[PDB]
Design a protein around this ligand. Sequence first.
Ligand SMILES: COc1ccc([C@@H]2CNC(=O)C2)cc1OC1CCCC1
Ligand SMILES: [Mg+2]
Ligand SMILES: [Zn+2]
Length: 330
Amino acid sequence: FGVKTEQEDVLAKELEDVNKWGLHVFRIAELSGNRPLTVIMHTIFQERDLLKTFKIPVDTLITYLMTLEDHYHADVAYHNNIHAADVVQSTHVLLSTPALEAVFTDLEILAAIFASAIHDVDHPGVSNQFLINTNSELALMYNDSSVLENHHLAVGFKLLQEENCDIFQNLTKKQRQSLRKMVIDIVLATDMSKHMNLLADLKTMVETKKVTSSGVLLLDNYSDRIQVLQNMVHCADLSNPTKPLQLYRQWTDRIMEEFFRQGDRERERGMEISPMCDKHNASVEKSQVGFIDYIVHPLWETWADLVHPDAQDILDTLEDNREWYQSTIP
Ligand SMILES: COc1ccc([C@@H]2CNC(=O)C2)cc1OC1CCCC1
Ligand SMILES: [Mg+2]
Ligand SMILES: [Zn+2]
């Protein structure tokens, strides 16, 4: 035909919000036939001219993206392809913040976006500790240390070896070694066990923050550049409470479903039920308020400082949503 179907047109129209915080990611998931990660990644790669810059064949990119997306679990309520697509898209927006204009190279941009896409791939919907406590083969392989995060990376990279999936086939060895290091550094930093140190270092950078004559941040060395990228993607991963409440609440429903399911498995097995995984002793609203007060607000406040005043609306929304959950505590 050569013209879009009406569903494809409606999808294209939704994708016009790809550069906006609060993209209707769940509608995109539905409209795309459960291919939000593929369609959002493809849109972002085109928008950023990544295919031309890195000589990525388009069929190779689509094959890889579908393969990656296929290895997110459809039965996992939160850590699935919709979450991945959300984190990609959120990272995409954070990358284009005025305070960061012309700071990152195309390869660093590629790293952050690719890292976002793969960062939860093959997540079983249970915690590292559950995998450790059950003596899972995964935990055995990874010595109980960032078990899932190591796995997400290993899977993300391994899938490049499937038929016509090597999207990095035209990168030089130098580009590939650099890209790989950055991707690993970013995804391993998504382990919540690393949050406090990641935030401490972000704070230290905001303390010593330097800005150019152009007004954007100055990042001289790899340590500062990767730290900002790690924190950016970590912010994207922890961005749900900063979204419009209609979106945020769907994420809360999902994380609670995933948590309660793990709790049910723990109970079944006679294991102690992990924090916030007990459907019979839950405080969904109190827990979101605590999540925000102790983890998300501290991070986003510091990010908002780093990129002042770019993230002011995101922070305002976070505080509005915090107050809404607070107001709903029974
Ligand atoms: C929308 O809420 C939440 C969204 C995301 C996360 C985790 C952050 N990183 C992950 O991999 C999942 C926790 C949430 O809420 C917590 C408080 C109550 C249950 C867990
Ligand atoms: Mg994760
Ligand atoms: Zn995630």
